[PDB]
Every structure is written in C-alpha cells, then in structure tokens.
Scaffold this active site. Structure first.
Site, PDB file in Angstrom:
ATOM      1  N   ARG A 108     -35.938  -7.142  23.723  1.00 44.56           N
ATOM      2  CA  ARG A 108     -35.964  -6.509  22.408  1.00 44.56           C
ATOM      3  C   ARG A 108     -34.650  -6.867  21.690  1.00 44.56           C
ATOM      4  O   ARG A 108     -33.572  -6.795  22.276  1.00 44.56           O
ATOM      5  CB  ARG A 108     -36.112  -4.982  22.563  1.00 44.56           C
ATOM      6  CG  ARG A 108     -36.348  -4.203  21.269  1.00 44.56           C
ATOM      7  CD  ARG A 108     -37.823  -3.985  20.933  1.00 44.56           C
ATOM      8  NE  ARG A 108     -38.598  -3.343  22.004  1.00 44.56           N
ATOM      9  CZ  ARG A 108     -38.221  -2.251  22.671  1.00 44.56           C
ATOM     10  NH1 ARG A 108     -37.065  -1.666  22.385  1.00 44.56           N
ATOM     11  NH2 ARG A 108     -38.991  -1.742  23.627  1.00 44.56           N
ATOM     12  N   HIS A 111     -39.017 -12.642  25.779  1.00 48.51           N
ATOM     13  CA  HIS A 111     -37.728 -12.262  25.227  1.00 48.51           C
ATOM     14  C   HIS A 111     -37.449 -10.782  25.397  1.00 48.51           C
ATOM     15  O   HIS A 111     -38.329 -10.008  25.730  1.00 48.51           O
ATOM     16  CB  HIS A 111     -37.691 -12.604  23.743  1.00 48.51           C
ATOM     17  CG  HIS A 111     -38.694 -11.841  22.932  1.00 48.51           C
ATOM     18  ND1 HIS A 111     -38.549 -10.503  22.637  1.00 48.51           N
ATOM     19  CD2 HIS A 111     -39.880 -12.217  22.396  1.00 48.51           C
ATOM     20  CE1 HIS A 111     -39.603 -10.086  21.958  1.00 48.51           C
ATOM     21  NE2 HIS A 111     -40.426 -11.106  21.800  1.00 48.51           N
ATOM     22  N   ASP A 128     -43.045 -15.754  17.743  1.00 56.25           N
ATOM     23  CA  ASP A 128     -43.143 -16.153  19.120  1.00 56.25           C
ATOM     24  C   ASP A 128     -44.519 -16.194  19.758  1.00 56.25           C
ATOM     25  O   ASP A 128     -44.598 -16.202  20.976  1.00 56.25           O
ATOM     26  CB  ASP A 128     -42.253 -15.238  19.928  1.00 56.25           C
ATOM     27  CG  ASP A 128     -42.643 -13.794  19.768  1.00 56.25           C
ATOM     28  OD1 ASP A 128     -43.715 -13.569  19.152  1.00 56.25           O
ATOM     29  OD2 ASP A 128     -41.900 -12.900  20.248  1.00 56.25           O
ATOM     30  N   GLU A 169     -45.715   0.224  13.116  1.00 56.25           N
ATOM     31  CA  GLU A 169     -46.111  -0.274  11.812  1.00 56.25           C
ATOM     32  C   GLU A 169     -47.509  -0.881  11.905  1.00 56.25           C
ATOM     33  O   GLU A 169     -48.285  -0.795  10.960  1.00 56.25           O
ATOM     34  CB  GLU A 169     -45.094  -1.307  11.284  1.00 56.25           C
ATOM     35  CG  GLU A 169     -45.321  -2.783  11.712  1.00 56.25           C
ATOM     36  CD  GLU A 169     -45.146  -3.024  13.211  1.00 56.25           C
ATOM     37  OE1 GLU A 169     -45.512  -4.113  13.705  1.00 56.25           O
ATOM     38  OE2 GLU A 169     -44.632  -2.123  13.899  1.00 56.25           O
ATOM     39  N   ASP A 170     -47.835  -1.461  13.054  1.00 57.51           N
ATOM     40  CA  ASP A 170     -49.121  -2.097  13.222  1.00 57.51           C
ATOM     41  C   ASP A 170     -50.235  -1.079  13.433  1.00 57.51           C
ATOM     42  O   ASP A 170     -51.367  -1.276  12.977  1.00 57.51           O
ATOM     43  CB  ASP A 170     -49.058  -3.117  14.374  1.00 57.51           C
ATOM     44  CG  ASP A 170     -48.500  -2.528  15.649  1.00 57.51           C
ATOM     45  OD1 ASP A 170     -47.589  -1.692  15.554  1.00 57.51           O
ATOM     46  OD2 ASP A 170     -48.965  -2.903  16.744  1.00 57.51           O
ATOM     47  N   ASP A 213     -46.246 -13.321  14.182  1.00 56.34           N
ATOM     48  CA  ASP A 213     -44.934 -13.148  14.783  1.00 56.34           C
ATOM     49  C   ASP A 213     -44.478 -14.581  15.120  1.00 56.34           C
ATOM     50  O   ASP A 213     -45.324 -15.468  15.315  1.00 56.34           O
ATOM     51  CB  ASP A 213     -45.026 -12.289  16.041  1.00 56.34           C
ATOM     52  CG  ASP A 213     -45.143 -10.791  15.732  1.00 56.34           C
ATOM     53  OD1 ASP A 213     -45.029 -10.379  14.544  1.00 56.34           O
ATOM     54  OD2 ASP A 213     -45.328 -10.024  16.698  1.00 56.34           O
ATOM     55  N   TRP A 232     -38.467  -0.983  15.912  1.00 57.01           N
ATOM     56  CA  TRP A 232     -39.707  -1.377  16.559  1.00 57.01           C
ATOM     57  C   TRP A 232     -40.767  -0.326  16.733  1.00 57.01           C
ATOM     58  O   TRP A 232     -40.459   0.835  16.969  1.00 57.01           O
ATOM     59  CB  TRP A 232     -39.404  -1.979  17.929  1.00 57.01           C
ATOM     60  CG  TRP A 232     -40.608  -2.500  18.660  1.00 57.01           C
ATOM     61  CD1 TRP A 232     -41.008  -3.797  18.734  1.00 57.01           C
ATOM     62  CD2 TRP A 232     -41.550  -1.742  19.449  1.00 57.01           C
ATOM     63  NE1 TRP A 232     -42.132  -3.902  19.519  1.00 57.01           N
ATOM     64  CE2 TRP A 232     -42.489  -2.660  19.969  1.00 57.01           C
ATOM     65  CE3 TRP A 232     -41.686  -0.384  19.770  1.00 57.01           C
ATOM     66  CZ2 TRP A 232     -43.555  -2.267  20.793  1.00 57.01           C
ATOM     67  CZ3 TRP A 232     -42.749   0.012  20.602  1.00 57.01           C
ATOM     68  CH2 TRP A 232     -43.667  -0.933  21.099  1.00 57.01           C
ATOM     69  N   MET A 234     -46.813 -15.564  24.368  1.00 52.28           N
ATOM     70  CA  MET A 234     -45.697 -15.054  23.601  1.00 52.28           C
ATOM     71  C   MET A 234     -44.463 -15.537  24.358  1.00 52.28           C
ATOM     72  O   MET A 234     -44.366 -15.338  25.569  1.00 52.28           O
ATOM     73  CB  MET A 234     -45.639 -13.530  23.562  1.00 52.28           C
ATOM     74  CG  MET A 234     -44.480 -13.070  22.679  1.00 52.28           C
ATOM     75  SD  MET A 234     -43.942 -11.381  22.872  1.00 52.28           S
ATOM     76  CE  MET A 234     -45.076 -10.508  21.708  1.00 52.28           C
TER      77      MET A 234
HETATM   78  O1  LIG Z   1     -34.577  -9.301  15.516  1.00 48.50           O
HETATM   79  C1  LIG Z   1     -35.739  -9.591  15.270  1.00 48.50           C
HETATM   80  C2  LIG Z   1     -36.860  -8.767  15.587  1.00 48.50           C
HETATM   81  C3  LIG Z   1     -38.081  -9.152  15.279  1.00 48.50           C
HETATM   82  N1  LIG Z   1     -38.378 -10.380  14.630  1.00 48.50           N
HETATM   83  C4  LIG Z   1     -39.787 -10.836  14.260  1.00 48.50           C
HETATM   84  O2  LIG Z   1     -40.583  -9.690  14.467  1.00 48.50           O
HETATM   85  C5  LIG Z   1     -41.688  -9.990  15.354  1.00 48.50           C
HETATM   86  C6  LIG Z   1     -42.050  -8.904  16.297  1.00 48.50           C
HETATM   87  O3  LIG Z   1     -40.987  -8.382  17.080  1.00 48.50           O
HETATM   88  P1  LIG Z   1     -41.021  -8.427  18.660  1.00 48.50           P
HETATM   89  O4  LIG Z   1     -40.947  -9.839  19.103  1.00 48.50           O
HETATM   90  O5  LIG Z   1     -40.081  -7.518  19.332  1.00 48.50           O
HETATM   91  O6  LIG Z   1     -42.561  -7.873  18.922  1.00 48.50           O
HETATM   92  P2  LIG Z   1     -43.266  -7.499  20.280  1.00 48.50           P
HETATM   93  O7  LIG Z   1     -42.869  -8.557  21.250  1.00 48.50           O
HETATM   94  O8  LIG Z   1     -42.699  -6.255  20.838  1.00 48.50           O
HETATM   95  O9  LIG Z   1     -44.792  -7.709  19.830  1.00 48.50           O
HETATM   96  C7  LIG Z   1     -41.070 -11.155  16.117  1.00 48.50           C
HETATM   97  O10 LIG Z   1     -42.053 -11.862  16.871  1.00 48.50           O
HETATM   98  C8  LIG Z   1     -40.452 -11.946  15.043  1.00 48.50           C
HETATM   99  O11 LIG Z   1     -41.415 -12.696  14.267  1.00 48.50           O
HETATM  100  C9  LIG Z   1     -37.342 -11.251  14.284  1.00 48.50           C
HETATM  101  O12 LIG Z   1     -37.630 -12.293  13.728  1.00 48.50           O
HETATM  102  N2  LIG Z   1     -36.066 -10.812  14.628  1.00 48.50           N
HETATM  103 MN   LIG Z   2     -42.329 -10.701  20.633  1.00 46.54          MN
END
Ligand SMILES: O=c1ccn([C@@H]2O[C@H](COP(=O)(O)OP(=O)(O)O)[C@@H](O)[C@H]2O)c(=O)[nH]1
Ligand SMILES: [Mn+2]
Ligand SMILES: O=c1ccn([C@@H]2O[C@H](COP(=O)(O)OP(=O)(O)O)[C@@H](O)[C@H]2O)c(=O)[nH]1
Ligand SMILES: [Ca+2]
EC number: 2.4.1.-
Lengths: 272, 123
Positions: free
Chosen positions: A219, A217, A124, A187-188, A122, A184, A214
């Site tokens: 959603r 941020h 972040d 998938e994992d 990801d 969201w 992380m």
């Molecule tokens: O609008 C978006 C949504 C998701 N992501 C990518 O998809 C990953 C996972 O999404 P999210 O950050 O919401 O994951 P969570 O924090 O819920 O693990 C992100 O870290 C990014 O790499 C992105 O690039 N743009």
């Molecule tokens: Mn994230």
C-alpha cells in the site's frame, strides 16, 4: 468506411503476462508505430464504434505504467478500439483520491475527443486474455474479474474496483464518481451502489476470459485505509446527488503529451 | 500472513454462531476488515487496530503506544499480529458480548446480504 466487426479477427485469446524483463518505452514506441502523440490510436482498416478513453488514476507509479503501456497498447489495438490513454497524476503529497482523479480523467478526455466510452483502469492491472474487451456494454462493465491477487477469483460479487467501463451516458447518470473518498477503500463500493440506485446492474466477462494480473505491491504512503469508508458507503443514495460530477473542482497544473500517453497533473485539493 | 477465505474459515471455527454470527458473516466481515491479513495494522484517529479482527488498542489490548488502555481482553496487542488466532478469537468474543457485532463497521453495509458467496467451498 467499413464498420469494424462486432468481434475482432486479430484477437489472440490468453497471453503470457510476466513482470521481469524491464521495459524500454522507446522499444515500446517502436513496437507500436500506429500509436500517435498523446497515446491516441484509431483503426485504419475499419470504423470502430467504440470511442474509448482509458483513464488511469496515478501518483508515483511510473514503473507500473511502463508495464501497463507495454501490454495494453498491443491489446487495445487488436481490439480495434478508437482509443486515447490518459494518466491523471495527482499533484502534491497529501491523501490519495482515486475516484476523484477518475472524474478528472472523464472531463479532461472530453476536451480532446468526443469519446462515448470510458475505461477506468488501475495502473497495475493487465488482462490475461484479449477477449476481455476494453469497451462499454448494455450495462456498466466490471473488467478485472479474476485477478491472480484473488486466486483468479472475484473477491465479492459487489466488487467494482480495478478496471471498469461505463458509457458516457451511464457515467453521467450516476453523477459520475464520488469526490469525497480520500485514502484507500470504499470508493468503488460507493460507485457500485450508485449503479444500483440508478437501475443499472454489473456486466462481466466470465472468470476465464476475465483473468488479470496485478503487479504486486505494498500500500502506498498517503493512501492508507479510509476509516470513514464504511459509513460513507451507507449514505451513497443521498450523497450521490451532492458529491460527484456536479461538485468536481480541480486545477490543471500541466498537460503532458508523450508518444504513448497523455499525462495530466492536477491539483484536486485536500481531505475536508 | 495473508490468509484465505478457507484457511480463515477453518481457523475461526470456534467463534461460529456466537452472538448469532455465522462463519459466512465472519468471512465477509474479515475480508473487508483486514483482507484476511493476520499482521494487518491500521491507524484510526490516534488509535491502532490489530490483526485479522482489527482489534483496537484504544480499549481492547495493551500496546506500548498507549498503556492507559483498559486492555479489556487482557492481552498485548502484538499477540494479534502472529498466526495463532486463539487469543484474537477470544478477544473478538469479548467485543461481541460487550459491544456487539457493530464493532466491525464492515458488517452492516457489506455483510447484510449475499452471504452464500462467503462459504468456503472446500472441505
Ligand atoms: O500512491 C498511489 C496510490 C494509488 N495509485 C493508483 O490507484 C490505483 C489503486 O490503488 P491500489 O493499487 O492500492 O489498489 P488495490 O491494489 O488495493 O486494488 C493504483 O492501481 C494506481 O492506478 C497511484 O497511482 N498511486
Ligand atoms: Mn494495486
Ligand atoms: O511515450 C513515452 C513516454 C515517456 N518516455 C520516456 O519516459 C520518461 C518518463 O519520465 P517521468 O514521467 O518520470 O517524467 P515527468 O513526466 O514526470 O517529467 C521520459 O523522460 C522519456 O525519456 C518515452 O520514451 N516515451
Ligand atoms: Ca494471536
């Protein structure tokens, strides 16, 4: 000509990860002169056996990517990896599809180099200990084990989200990742199920060397919780034969090569 | 308000064993359901689910959106967006008695095993 050591002598152990001082990619480029056009780095000192393609699912996360690049380029180099950076940018404004962009990352990285290992990360997540190697193991590797987001704790043992690593063969064995998870979640867990249905388990660094941060941020719009995730997750066993690498279709709108990375904008279609 | 496994476990005490579901299964279900966020608001095909338990306004609570709801729990959906869980829990109890645990879709696929990890390990 000399094979790199099983463990890198450059490792530094735990590092400080903070997200305040704004980064300057130009400054980052300077601090990383060995990184070539497209975001490729290969060890000169020794021969690494880890040909690694790091795949980043992406859409409107440029600030996160700067930090990601700033921390990981130096780390991955210390880890003596023969790596390439790929940012798979989803074109358009419809529902986000993380797993599908990762499948695209896999096929597109293969066009450049004969990578034998794939790290899906990801944008972040930054590792807090360089002992957490970004490479493949005897079993699929879950890398982002102890995120600050979760109290430096794994939220649940069946968790495979964030940063994972699979060898080409391990990836091929599960027909890759699903293409039908839009929005969201799930998938994992589906991928996790895929590993079990193929006799594979999950390998992980311990919770200390596996500490990660992380970037905080909310959603993203267009990536709301997928209401169907829970039902899709229960039919993985059968749907993994029909949804995955073998059913992937997408169109490349553009391939960008920057000094610190390769970014591929694709059109992966709509939720149907 | 993003709570945690333990806060949740402590707050939720009175729902334990009801209809046979333990606190282990609830912590597991609530994590996948709301991430333990009391202000969680999620849309689902024209309806909206609220709070920690992600209670739907389609049948269980009254929301300004669609007032025709049977409002089975007899509460305003907004009252499931604050940090007092007593009414959320009371409503969750009705759902359990009427529809059962399968209202929570995370239960069967995510919470049918490996429950030990869900215990709050703090007194
Ligand atoms: O609008 C978006 C949504 C998701 N992501 C990518 O998809 C990953 C996972 O999404 P999210 O950050 O919401 O994951 P969570 O924090 O819920 O693990 C992100 O870290 C990014 O790499 C992105 O690039 N743009
Ligand atoms: Mn994230
Ligand atoms: O290795 C790199 C990659 C990017 N950039 C800079 O970062 C900006 C990124 O722009 P963005 O991705 O938003 O533009 P797009 O690629 O989508 O045209 C570029 O314009 C450059 O000035 C840089 O200096 N070094
Ligand atoms: Ca309440």
């Amino acid at each position: 000509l000399t094979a790199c050591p099983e463990e890198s002598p450059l490792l530094v152990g735990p590092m400080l990860i903070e997200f305040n001082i704004p980064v300057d990619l130009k400054l980052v480029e300077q601090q990383n002169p060995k990184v070539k056009l497209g975001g490729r780095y290969t060890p000169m000192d020794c021969i690494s056996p880890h040909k690694v393609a790091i795949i980043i699912p992406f859409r409107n996360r440029q600030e996160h990517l700067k930090y990601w690049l700033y921390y990981l380029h130096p780390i991955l180099q210390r880890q003596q990896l023969d790596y390439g950076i790929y940012v798979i940018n989803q074109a358009g404004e419809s529902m986000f599809n993380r797993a599908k962009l990762l499948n695209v990352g896999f096929k597109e990285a293969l066009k450049d180099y004969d990578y034998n290992c794939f790290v899906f990360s990801d944008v972040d997540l930054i590792p807090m200990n360089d002992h957490n190697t970004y490479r493949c193991f005897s079993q699929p590797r879950h890398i982002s084990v102890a995120m600050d987001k979760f109290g430096f704790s794994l939220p649940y043992v069946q968790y495979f989200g964030g940063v994972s690593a699979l060898s080409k063969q391990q990836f091929l064995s599960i027909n890759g990742f699903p293409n039908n998870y839009w929005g969201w979640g799930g998938e994992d867990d589906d991928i996790y199920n895929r590993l079990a249905f193929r006799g594979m388990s999950v390998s992980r660094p311990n919770a200390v060397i596996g500490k990660c941060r992380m970037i905080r941020h909310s959603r993203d719009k267009k990536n709301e919780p997928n209401p169907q995730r829970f039902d899709r997750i229960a039919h993985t066993k059968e749907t993994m034969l029909s949804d995955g690498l073998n059913s992937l279709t997408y169109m490349v709108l553009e391939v960008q090569r920057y000094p610190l990375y390769t970014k591929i904008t694709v059109d992966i279609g709509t939720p149907s | 308000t993003e709570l945690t496994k333990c806060k949740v476990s402590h707050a939720i005490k009175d729902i334990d064993g009801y209809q046979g579901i333990s606190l282990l299964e609830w912590a597991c279900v609530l994590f996948h359901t709301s991430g333990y966020d009391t202000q969680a608001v999620v849309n689902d095909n024209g309806s909206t689910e609220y709070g920690l338990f992600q209670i739907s306004d389609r049948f269980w609570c009254k929301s300004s959106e669609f007032p025709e709801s049977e409002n089975i729990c007899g509460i305003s959906c907004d009252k499931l967006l604050d940090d007092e869980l007593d009414d959320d829990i009371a409503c969750a109890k009705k759902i359990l008695a009427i529809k059962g645990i399968d209202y929570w879709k995370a239960y069967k696929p995510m919470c049918s095993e490996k429950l030990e990890q869900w215990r709050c390990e703090k007194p």
